[PDB]
Design an enzyme around this catalytic site. Sequence first.
Site, short mmCIF file in Angstrom:
data_model
loop_
_atom_site.label_atom_id
_atom_site.label_comp_id
_atom_site.label_asym_id
_atom_site.label_seq_id
_atom_site.Cartn_x
_atom_site.Cartn_y
_atom_site.Cartn_z
N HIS A 201 62.89 122.91 -44.85
CA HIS A 201 61.55 123.27 -44.38
C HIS A 201 61.57 123.44 -42.86
CE1 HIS A 201 57.20 123.74 -44.79
NE2 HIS A 201 57.18 123.22 -43.57
N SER A 243 64.71 129.16 -43.80
CA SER A 243 63.82 128.21 -43.13
C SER A 243 63.93 128.31 -41.62
CB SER A 243 64.14 126.77 -43.57
OG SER A 243 63.79 126.53 -44.92
N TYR A 246 61.47 130.24 -39.55
CA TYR A 246 60.11 129.76 -39.34
C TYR A 246 60.01 128.82 -38.14
CZ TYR A 246 59.06 132.00 -43.76
OH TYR A 246 58.90 132.98 -44.72
N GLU A 327 62.71 130.71 -53.01
CA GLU A 327 61.60 130.01 -52.38
C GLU A 327 61.12 129.00 -53.41
OE1 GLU A 327 58.40 132.34 -50.94
OE2 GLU A 327 59.64 133.40 -49.46
N1 LIG Z 1 57.42 131.83 -48.03
C1 LIG Z 1 57.53 130.81 -47.03
C2 LIG Z 1 56.44 130.62 -46.17
C3 LIG Z 1 56.48 129.63 -45.17
C4 LIG Z 1 57.63 128.82 -45.01
C5 LIG Z 1 58.73 129.00 -45.89
C6 LIG Z 1 59.87 128.18 -45.72
C7 LIG Z 1 60.97 128.33 -46.57
C8 LIG Z 1 60.93 129.30 -47.58
C9 LIG Z 1 59.81 130.12 -47.75
C10 LIG Z 1 58.69 129.99 -46.90
C11 LIG Z 1 59.89 127.14 -44.61
O1 LIG Z 1 60.90 126.44 -44.45
N2 LIG Z 1 58.82 126.99 -43.81
C12 LIG Z 1 57.70 127.74 -43.93
O2 LIG Z 1 56.75 127.57 -43.18
#
Ligand SMILES: Nc1ccc2c3c(cccc13)C(=O)NC2=O
Length: 350
Positions: A201, A243, A246, A327
């Site tokens: 994350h 991840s 992000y 995801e």
């Molecule tokens: N579709 C996503 C939307 C947001 C995130 C996300 C993440 C991992 C896989 C998919 C998504 C993540 O680590 N942080 C996220 O904030």
Amino acid sequence: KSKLAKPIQDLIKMIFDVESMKKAMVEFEIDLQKMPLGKLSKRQIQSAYSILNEVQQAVSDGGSESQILDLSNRFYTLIPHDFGMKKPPLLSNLEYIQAKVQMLDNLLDIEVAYSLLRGGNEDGDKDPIDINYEKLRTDIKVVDKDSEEAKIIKQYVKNTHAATHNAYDLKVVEIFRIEREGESQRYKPFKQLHNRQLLWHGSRTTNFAGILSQGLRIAPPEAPVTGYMFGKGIYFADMVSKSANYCHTSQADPIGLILLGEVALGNMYELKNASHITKLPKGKHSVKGLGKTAPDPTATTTLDGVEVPLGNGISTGINDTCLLYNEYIVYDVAQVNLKYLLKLKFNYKT
Ligand SMILES: Nc1ccc2c3c(cccc13)C(=O)NC2=O
């Protein structure tokens, strides 16, 4: 002075840095002159979500253009923006509205960070760092760089760095074992579930004080379900690459933070395309967006009984999917137990 280890001191200073909070807001195009860090309130953010929810409905259902104009003016008056010399765009485009819903998810965490920073700091018997650390209500410890725990995690980082995301390298600067107060307890019921995995994350460094104190959370009731690909849940990935993006780092600001959380997936409801999920099908515990690439199922290991998909990025047989990577989404805040926080150094290829 601080009793905390140095790496942890550097971590606290970093997550509570006021200048980073402002940079984040300027990047969302907020007007820091009309809207200073101290003006942000939760009620304010809730109303903004509702406004975005209504305007999203009017665009989709063909509501009056006067309606969309009115909602736009109320939104910009609630949250003052600075577009420089350009005219302010109307909230009449679904992609722009999604951008704005994202801005609010971040403002929720920045608001928590500032509130904690200005809270009970009168104590002179404690170092400021030690005081802010205690405000996180999270026990943080440095994982020994040479232990098995760290080896497995570095393996997970190295092997799952995707092909198309190789616009940068990743260096694990430091690994922290974290345990949020009361979290192990609310998560207890889910140890009964099968298919528990150690997933990634990523988030802005500005969100971490909020994440550590309140834990990861789902968007509030006011947010549109549309503002999120698979509905209002908590998102994770199995490729550090997905991840890592992000984290929002750059050549100018290369250090990012990322979390490894144990997530109780159980029976996954597999999807190949977006779906604004409200109800989860009977017998399903989470959602799994199928990607074209995923870690090699051959190399999967265990770490304290939790599966770690540390395999190398291999192409999966599914072709009729919109996603490049997997995801995972859980729709219950209690379905995750955070474990480690990594300090990453993004080395940009130049
Ligand atoms: N579709 C996503 C939307 C947001 C995130 C996300 C993440 C991992 C896989 C998919 C998504 C993540 O680590 N942080 C996220 O904030």
